[PDB]
Design a protein around this ligand. Structure first.
Ligand SMILES: [Zn+2]
Lengths: 506, 312
């Protein structure tokens, strides 16, 4: 604290720093920051404390289960060092109130989130503000730390991070071969009944399958009765799968179930078929109480930690798993696949957080030349290095974010894709823009999407071909919140597949 | 047979090292001396790990030279015992771990005191204390660990004797053998051979830095401080000459500017070393992953975490 080079210790005690997220690395980072000398710290996180979090996030206890991770963290740190100017934000970093002017307050920004969408945003905010970003991530025994500064190093999106698997609807509900396909179907099933009605998440058998030739309105008209929804979802929808004989020539598709047939005949233990049908009935009744408190058609956001929500997905995925002759898996085994649970321990977070402040001290010393990317392995490599350091790479000249004039090329069907698909699934989802502004390169500035509310809602249903968009049409996408401008080249293609709406050349 | 309150708490780590290795960890008690900068880090992620009990031992009293260097000590605890002032905070990290506190110094403990501990971790001890305790632990098949922090540098040592663990690759389950050596043999290496000279070039300089600092803690009852830097470096600049030649090694093998990056307890260096050292304690009590044999040297400046084996 006091024992540091005097110019370095002055920059720490006066400089302002930002922590994005109070998760695993978040708690260890606040500690190492305060015990080093950092007194001006801003912490922002939206999640709340869960009983599963207090094994590695020591700033929280069983007393604080339910409260926000940001408010409790500010209270817990003011105990061992009350003279700490810490500002706690119980908000999302994606909120437009945290503009480039807000990010430019800090001399250092450090990431502590797990999802790429928010990390892509914080990456683009720290570039626009030209404030160094220390990106960090943990996974079991492994962890990584790197430094991002505009014009010096490559940004978070200079290289494509590994994307998860996405299975098409024709494979999810018509030919589910892996146990994961039943879990996605159960997560689909929970969304149709007690969640927001999604289009691509249909659980009913698909009739337009290439290998071939409302559910919620019925769910709400049935009264959410467990006995009735069982027979319709597990036998009738399977019998309409038997209507289509073309798929079943290759593999076996038995067998439909029956509530009166199977019910009469430590989460790590795989139960029988008679038990999962009972938890399916129990889940509907418990989720009907969680839905009765809500009003005006309010939905229920699925949570992996929610017992009633977990009991439904586990029982529904296992019953369908037994339906399609697949060997059923356990509840403890499926909770890791349902909610994408990343196993994390306190030691891995502590080691990574210590490396963050060490890299931060080199940034505040002007020693950005000495900054390194550090890998925490599980066993020593042939160089006997458990912590492997390496130099930072220069910015990628072909990145679509931090380059001079980024310019992507999208291949899609112009007469099929709507403008709403362009806004949500293309510009905001794939390209991770928060509040986008898209116009057509044609001299007049044909406005497709506007940042302000509903200025372009009359265009969402319209197809892209209704605006003269053709093969080679150039769209200028702007996210002034991120101070980011992207040019989208349009290529017209009709040979993509009925489950593929677009694709990027790369 | 764990309760339901322990299943939801340790849920994220049971999915990492299994349930059986967690039950082996639940029935373990660890002895930790040197409740300070590094000791507080080790004690934290050990009580969170889920051991049965942790005994924090430290004879030195709270000196007003670590105002925020330790987070287990609330403000204004000068004059109180360092282990007692760290009890209430460490106990709240996990109510299912009875955190015991000892006041008598580690030197005046009989051999029968250590028998109740499945593992012992030393911190801020002189060489003679580290050798004394490791010899006692190796006599009674007790797992021995030690480590310290100096500026941007740090080290961890482990001695488990004949330690059999269980790794797996493919799912599977494989047993292996790893034999450690007492710390006295790892600190005094015969650096005169065709193998010894050839293996010396591949050895990190933090090991000889550890020798110079242990010799400093031996000659004077404290590590070098920032206030005495004015000529604590000159003593360090002469211990490096009067020790490296005693082992028959070139003097400038350890760089000369080392007296500027190993002079205090830096909280980031405590979390890194404390996280690695405590993880070696967890995988040892559970007898699961292969532990590091037998040193681990950290360099916070270059970002190096080198695992050395300098026993034989
Ligand atoms: Zn880039």
């Amino acid at each position: 604290s006091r024992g540091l080079p005097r110019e370095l210790a002055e920059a720490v005690a006066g400089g302002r720093v930002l922590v994005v997220g109070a998760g695993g690395i978040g708690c260890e980072l606040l500690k190492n920051l305060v015990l080093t000398g950092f007194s001006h710290i801003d912490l922002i996180d939206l999640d709340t404390i869960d009983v599963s979090n207090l094994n590695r996030q020591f700033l929280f206890q069983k007393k604080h289960v339910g409260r926000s991770k940001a408010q409790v963290a500010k209270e817990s740190v003011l105990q061992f060092y009350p003279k700490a100017n810490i500002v706690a934000y119980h908000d999302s970093i994606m909120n437009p109130d945290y503009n480039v002017e807000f990010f430019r307050q800090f001399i250092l920004v450090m990431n502590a989130l797990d999802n790429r969408a928010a990390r892509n945003h914080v990456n683009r905010m720290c570039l626009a503000a030209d404030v160094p970003l220390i990106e960090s991530g943990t996974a079991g025994y492994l962890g990584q730390v790197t430094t991002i500064k505009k014009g010096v190093t490559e940004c978070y999106e200079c290289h494509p991070k590994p994307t998860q698997r996405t299975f098409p609807g024709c494979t999810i509900r018509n030919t589910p071969s892996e146990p994961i396909h039943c879990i996605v179907w159960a997560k689909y099933l929970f969304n149709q009944l007690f969640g927001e009605e999604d289009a691509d998440q249909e659980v009913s058998p698909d009739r337009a399958d290439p290998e071939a030739a409302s559910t919620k309105e019925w769910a709400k008209s049935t009264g959410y009765d467990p006995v009735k929804l069982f027979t319709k979802l597990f036998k009738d929808d399977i019998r309409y799968l038997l209507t289509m004989d073309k798929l079943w020539r290759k593999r076996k598709p038995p067998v439909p179930l029956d509530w009166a047939e199977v019910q009469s005949q430590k989460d790590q233990q795989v139960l029988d078929v008679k038990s999962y049908a009972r938890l399916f009935s129990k889940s509907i009744e418990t989720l009907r109480v969680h839905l009765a408190e809500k009003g005006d058609g309010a939905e229920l956001i699925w949570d992996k930690d929610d017992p009633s929500a977990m009991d439904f997905v586990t029982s529904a995925a296992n019953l369908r798993m037994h339906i399609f002759s697949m060997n059923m898996k356990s509840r403890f085994d499926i909770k890791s696949m349902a909610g994408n649970i990343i196993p994390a321990i306190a030691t891995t977070n502590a080691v990574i957080a210590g490396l963050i402040v060490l890299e931060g001290l080199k940034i505040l010393s002007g020693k950005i030349d000495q900054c390194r990317t550090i890998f925490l392995n599980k066993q020593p490599n042939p160089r006997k290095k458990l912590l492997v350091p390496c130099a930072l790479d220069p910015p990628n000249p072909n990145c679509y974010v931090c380059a001079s004039k980024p310019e992507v090329t999208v291949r899609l069907n112009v007469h099929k894709v709507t403008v709403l698909t362009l806004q949500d699934k293309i510009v905001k989802e794939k390209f991770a823009m928060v509040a986008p502004d898209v116009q057509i390169e044609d001299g007049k500035g044909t406005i497709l999407i506007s940042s302000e509310e509903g200025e372009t809602e009359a265009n969402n249903h319209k197809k892209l071909s209704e605006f003269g968009i053709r093969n080679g049409s150039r769209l200028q996408a702007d996210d002034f919140l991120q101070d980011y401008t992207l040019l989208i080249n349009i290529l017209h293609s009709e040979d993509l597949g009925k489950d593929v709406e677009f694709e990027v050349v790369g | 047979g764990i309760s339901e309150e322990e299943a939801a708490q340790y849920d994220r780590q049971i999915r990492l090292w299994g349930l059986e290795a967690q039950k082996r960890l639940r029935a373990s008690r660890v002895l930790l001396v040197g409740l300070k900068g590094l000791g507080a880090e080790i004690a934290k992620n050990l009580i969170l790990a889920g051991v049965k009990g942790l005994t924090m031992l430290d004879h030195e009293q709270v000196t007003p030279e670590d105002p925020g260097a330790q987070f287990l000590i609330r403000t204004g605890s000068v004059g109180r015992n360092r282990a007692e002032a760290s009890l209430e905070r460490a106990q709240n990290l996990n109510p299912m771990v009875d955190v015991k506190v000892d006041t008598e110094d580690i030197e005046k403990k009989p051999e029968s005191f250590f028998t109740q501990f499945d593992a012992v971790c030393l911190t801020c001890c002189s060489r003679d204390v580290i050798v004394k305790v490791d010899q006692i632990c190796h006599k009674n098949s007790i797992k021995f660990f030690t480590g310290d922090v100096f500026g941007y540098h740090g080290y961890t040592f482990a001695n488990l004797g004949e330690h059999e663990f269980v790794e797996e690759k493919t799912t599977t389950m494989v047993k292996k053998k790893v034999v450690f050596c007492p710390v006295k043999e790892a600190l005094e290496v015969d650096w005169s051979s065709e193998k010894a000279k050839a293996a010396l070039k591949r050895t990190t300089s933090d090991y000889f830095l550890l020798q110079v600092l242990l010799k400093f803690r031996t000659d004077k009852g404290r590590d070098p401080s920032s206030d005495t830097y004015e000529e604590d470096s000159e003593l360090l600049l002469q211990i490096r000459n009067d020790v490296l030649d005693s082992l028959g090694i070139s003097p400038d093998l350890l760089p000369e500017d080392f007296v500027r990056y190993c002079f205090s307890e830096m909280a980031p260096v405590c979390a890194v070393v404390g996280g690695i050292l405590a993880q070696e304690i967890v995988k040892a009590l559970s007898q699961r992953d292969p532990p590091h044999n037998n040193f681990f040297f950290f360099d916070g400046m270059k970002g190096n975490g080198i695992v050395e084996c300098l026993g034989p």
